[PDB]
Amino acid sequence: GESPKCPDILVVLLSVMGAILLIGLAPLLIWKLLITIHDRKEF
Amino acid sequence: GALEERCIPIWWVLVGVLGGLLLLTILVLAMWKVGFFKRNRP
Numbered sequence: 204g205e206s207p208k209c210p211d212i213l214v215v216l217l218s219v220m221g222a223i224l225l226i227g228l229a230p231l232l233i234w235k236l237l238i239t240i241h242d243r244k245e246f
Numbered sequence: 247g248a249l250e251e252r253c254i255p256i257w258w259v260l261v262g263v264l265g266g267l268l269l270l271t272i273l274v275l276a277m278w279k280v281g282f283f284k285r286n287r288p
Contacts, residue, residue: 208251209252209254210253212255215253215254215259216258216259216261216262218262219258220262221266222266223262223263223269223270231277238285238287241287242286
């Protein structure tokens with residue numbers, strides 16, 4: 204950014220690992236959420 | 247002013263991908279084993 208024109212390596216590495224979690228969790232979260240509603244929604 | 251000195255060296259990007267994916271695998275297996283995902287309803 205202002206010297207580390209190259210963001211810190213650890214910061215970048217951690218961010219990628221975090222992004223992977225969000226990507227993997229979204230499909231699962233949507234699936235889990237839909238089941239809960241079909242399951243929880245009192246008919 | 248030569249090697250812009252990559253702000254994204256190839257190794258670290260590659261390494262982060264493997265670690266994040268490995269973590270997802272363990273979480274998915276754990277949820278499945280607990281039946282969390284088998285729980286579709288009781």
